[PDB]
Amino acid sequence: GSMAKAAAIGIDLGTTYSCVGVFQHGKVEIIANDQGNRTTPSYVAFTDTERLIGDAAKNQVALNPQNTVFDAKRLIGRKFGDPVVQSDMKHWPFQVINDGDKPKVQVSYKGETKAFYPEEISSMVLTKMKEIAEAYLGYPVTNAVITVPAYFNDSQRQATKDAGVIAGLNVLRIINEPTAAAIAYGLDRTGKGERNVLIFDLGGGTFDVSILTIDDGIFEVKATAGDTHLGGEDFDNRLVNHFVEEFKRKHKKDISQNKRAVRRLRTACERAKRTLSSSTQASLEIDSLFEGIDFYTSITRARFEELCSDLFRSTLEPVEKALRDAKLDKAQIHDLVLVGGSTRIPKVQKLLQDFFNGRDLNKSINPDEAVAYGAAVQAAILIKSTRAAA
Numbered sequence: 023g024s025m026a027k028a029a030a031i032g033i034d035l036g037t038t039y040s041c042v043g044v045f046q047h048g049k050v051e052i053i054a055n056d057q058g059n060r061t062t063p064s065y066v067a068f069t070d071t072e073r074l075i076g077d078a079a080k081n082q083v084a085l086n087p088q089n090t091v092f093d094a095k096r097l098i099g100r101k102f103g104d105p106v107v108q109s110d111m112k113h114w115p116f117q118v119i120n121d122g123d124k125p126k127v128q129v130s131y132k133g134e135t136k137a138f139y140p141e142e143i144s145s146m147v148l149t150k151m152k153e154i155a156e157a158y159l160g161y162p163v164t165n166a167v168i169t170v171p172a173y174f175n176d177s178q179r180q181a182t183k184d185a186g187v188i189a190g191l192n193v194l195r196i197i198n199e200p201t202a203a204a205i206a207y208g209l210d211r212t213g214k215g216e217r218n219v220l221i222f223d224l225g226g227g228t229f230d231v232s233i234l235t236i237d238d239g240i241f242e243v244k245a246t247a248g249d250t251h252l253g254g255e256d257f258d259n260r261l262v263n264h265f266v267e268e269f270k271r272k273h274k275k276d277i278s279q280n281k282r283a284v285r286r287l288r289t290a291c292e293r294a295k296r297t298l299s300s301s302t303q304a305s306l307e308i309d310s311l312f313e314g315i316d317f318y319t320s321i322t323r324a325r326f327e328e329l330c331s332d333l334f335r336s337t338l339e340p341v342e343k344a345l346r347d348a349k350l351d352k353a354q355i356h357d358l359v360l361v362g363g364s365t366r367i368p369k370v371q372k373l374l375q376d377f378f379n380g381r382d383l384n385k386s387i388n389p390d391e392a393v394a395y396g397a398a399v400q401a402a403i404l405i406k407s408t409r410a411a412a
């Protein structure tokens with residue numbers, strides 16, 4: 023009669039990391055890639071012989087900086103002349119060129135110089151998320167919901183859809199990241215009456231706060247605020263500067279000019295930063311860091327909290343601005359939702375909870391997975407084709 027339908031997937035197409043989920047048997051499964059990772063770097067690398075996507079691209083970035091593309095989401099649907107684009111280009115080791123006032127990334131690939139639109143790079147990331155899902159399901163996937171930031175305009179939303187079409191996906195819907203995070207907690211299934219939800223999204227490079235109103239499952243974005251210069255990478259930089267100074271004191275050597283030693287230090291710092299979210303201290307153990315000197319040291323959670331204290335406190339300014347813009351008081355917020363791996367930082371949680379006079383925070387769904395979780399829930403709802411009974 024009628025063949026069973028393939029499951030639809032939910033993709034969080036992130037600036038730095040992407041995540042894929044599927045809703046089956048009344049629950050969401052976040053799908054790990056072939057290296058066992060639940061999130062995949064939004065990186066595409068080009069060589070003379072291969073195109074690498076995800077973890078394989080990110081793991082060779084150090085020796086191939088000019089031909090490894092990341093941050094395509096900061097370029098999607100924007101004009102080359104845009105002041106956001108011009109400022110960002112100074113931080114990127116890859117070439118961004120102007121083609122009819124549209125940015126394109128230019129790389130060496132398979133013996134030739136090739137330029138790609140940002141939607142073409144994003145389609146390569148979406149192709150990898152589709153293959154991750156098909157490896158788990160064991161059949162081809164066609165249907166997907168893809169999420170975007172709430173501040174994305176029509177051009178940025180259309181370019182995201184275009185990336186989906188290039189990847190061979192049927193895009194069911196483009197949904198806002200804060201809406202997907204609310205759906206993950208079922209905040210649209212609480213019945214009649216207005217609820218005010220604050221989403222606190224602290225990423226690798228940016229911070230976004232959104233205030234949504236939910237009435238009978240209908241979402242309205244009331245206010246958005248944030249800091250484009252605040253994220254996980256800034257906390258990593260604070261530890262890097264700290265250990266560079268520590269090496270100077272202990273061995274009387276300045277390492278800041280050996281890129282390999284700095285990179286090994288930064289890699290070790292990001293891991294120590296993660297350990298400090300569950301432990302009160304963390305060890306740093308690098309062999310032959312500089313001039314055959316081994317760097318074996320430690321950092322307490324209290325010292326790390328001191329090093330990033332101004333940065334953590336600055337997350338409350340966009341919160342107060344969003345609340346003023348929404349014309350609401352903090353007591354009027356019904357639910358608080360955490361999004362992004364950097365929200366696992368206990369001090370970040372403590373500051374926000376204290377700001378909302380001890381209120382519980384929704385953090386039960388892994389914050390780096392909540393957006394894809396909500397997108398998978400929506401995708402399963404959008405493919406239902408039930409016919410009314412008599």
Ligand SMILES: Nc1ncnc2c1nc(Br)n2[C@@H]1O[C@H](CO)[C@@H](O)[C@H]1O
Pocket residue numbers: 038039225226227253254255292295296297299362363364365366367390
């Ligand atoms: N447990 C964690 N504690 C502290 N930080 C974390 C954690 N997990 C993740 Br993931 N991060 C950081 O989140 C950002 C995601 O783009 C990166 O800067 C990661 O370092």
Ligand SMILES: [Mg+2]
Pocket residue numbers: 034036037199225393
């Ligand atoms: Mg995100």
